[PDB]
Scaffold this active site. Structure first.
Site, PDB file in Angstrom:
ATOM      1  N   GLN A  60      -4.502  -9.045  -3.526  1.00 39.00           N
ATOM      2  CA  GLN A  60      -5.046  -8.940  -2.177  1.00 39.00           C
ATOM      3  C   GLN A  60      -6.236  -9.882  -2.004  1.00 39.00           C
ATOM      4  OE1 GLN A  60      -6.097  -4.999  -0.829  1.00 39.00           O
ATOM      5  NE2 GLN A  60      -7.000  -5.777   1.073  1.00 39.00           N
TER       6      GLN A  60
ATOM      7  N   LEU B 165       5.420   0.716   2.281  1.00 37.57           N
ATOM      8  CA  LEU B 165       4.671   0.003   3.300  1.00 37.57           C
ATOM      9  C   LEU B 165       5.506  -0.341   4.528  1.00 37.57           C
ATOM     10  CD1 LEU B 165       2.601  -2.421   1.063  1.00 37.57           C
ATOM     11  CD2 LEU B 165       1.990  -0.118   1.882  1.00 37.57           C
TER      12      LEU B 165
ATOM     13  N   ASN C 283      -4.315  -3.704   6.378  1.00 37.23           N
ATOM     14  CA  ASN C 283      -4.898  -3.136   7.594  1.00 37.23           C
ATOM     15  C   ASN C 283      -5.610  -1.832   7.265  1.00 37.23           C
ATOM     16  OD1 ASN C 283      -3.130  -0.784   8.142  1.00 37.23           O
ATOM     17  ND2 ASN C 283      -1.516  -2.357   8.365  1.00 37.23           N
TER      18      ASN C 283
ATOM     19  N   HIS D  98       2.877  -1.981   7.592  1.00 35.17           N
ATOM     20  CA  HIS D  98       2.260  -3.278   7.373  1.00 35.17           C
ATOM     21  C   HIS D  98       3.252  -4.327   7.832  1.00 35.17           C
ATOM     22  CE1 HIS D  98      -1.261  -1.917   5.028  1.00 35.17           C
ATOM     23  NE2 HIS D  98      -0.472  -0.882   4.803  1.00 35.17           N
TER      24      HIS D  98
ATOM     25  N   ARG E  13      -8.979  -8.009  -5.091  1.00 39.60           N
ATOM     26  CA  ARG E  13      -8.333  -6.820  -5.631  1.00 39.60           C
ATOM     27  C   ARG E  13      -6.942  -7.207  -6.118  1.00 39.60           C
ATOM     28  NH1 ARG E  13      -5.646  -2.255  -2.683  1.00 39.60           N
ATOM     29  NH2 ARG E  13      -5.842  -0.393  -3.968  1.00 39.60           N
TER      30      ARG E  13
ATOM     31  N   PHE F 127       1.801  -4.233  -8.746  1.00 34.70           N
ATOM     32  CA  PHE F 127       1.756  -3.854  -7.337  1.00 34.70           C
ATOM     33  C   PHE F 127       1.477  -5.079  -6.462  1.00 34.70           C
ATOM     34  CE2 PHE F 127      -0.958  -1.265  -4.075  1.00 34.70           C
ATOM     35  CZ  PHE F 127      -0.006  -1.468  -3.101  1.00 34.70           C
TER      36      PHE F 127
ATOM     37  N   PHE G 176      -1.694  -9.002   1.486  1.00 36.45           N
ATOM     38  CA  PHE G 176      -1.200  -8.748   0.145  1.00 36.45           C
ATOM     39  C   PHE G 176      -0.112  -9.772  -0.176  1.00 36.45           C
ATOM     40  CE2 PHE G 176      -1.360  -4.006   1.486  1.00 36.45           C
ATOM     41  CZ  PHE G 176      -2.708  -3.932   1.337  1.00 36.45           C
TER      42      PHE G 176
END
Length: 165
Positions: free
Chosen positions: A63, A122, A102, A126, A55, A60, A113
């Site tokens: 991942q 985040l 997570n 995270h 992804r 952004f 990420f």
């Protein structure tokens, strides 16, 4: 007690792109850093080598880390299927942050990420545990193969990985 550096050699549809290296903050988040370090060397018998970035959302993050199901539904840590949030000392300050993916409190596994923007929402949810030390240009070049919904237009893999020091 210097912080470890690992590397990923990235490939795009099997063709070498380049190398990204990461400082892991084992001084501040030792348990979380050690999980990523050992998954990068493969020394426990499983890990990141050969796995894909499933992804990628330009502007952004990228991942990765799901070496068992290749789609965001799998992965496991060196401690078991999940481990706890260690601390939230470090924040999501800009591009190049390494932070754990997570699915709720205390659900860290192997997914992560690499940020390509500041992602301050985040913070406190995270765990941040490293940063890109070299090859941010190669993360930028990955990002081009992403899309708004995260699907990748080519297959982006970790062709090799390990520890540099």
């Amino acid at each position: 007690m210097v912080n470890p550096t690992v590397f990923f050699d990235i490939a795009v549809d099997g063709e070498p792109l380049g190398r990204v290296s990461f400082e892991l903050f084992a001084d501040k988040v030792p348990k979380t850093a050690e999980n990523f370090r050992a998954l990068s060397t493969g020394e426990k018998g499983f890990g990141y080598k050969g796995s894909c970035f499933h992804r990628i959302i330009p502007g952004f993050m990228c991942q990765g880390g799901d070496f068992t199901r290749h789609n965001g539904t799998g992965g496991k840590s060196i401690y078991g299927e999940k481990f706890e949030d260690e601390n939230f000392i470090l924040k999501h300050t800009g591009p190049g942050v390494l932070t754990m993916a997570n699915a709720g409190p205390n659900t860290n596994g192997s997914q992560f990420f690499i940020s390509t923007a500041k992602t301050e929402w985040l913070d406190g949810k995270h765990v941040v545990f490293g940063k890109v030390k070299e090859g941010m240009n190669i993360v930028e070049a990955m990002e081009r193969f992403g899309s708004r919904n995260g699907k990748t237009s080519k297959k982006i893999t970790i062709a090799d990985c390990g520890q540099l020091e």
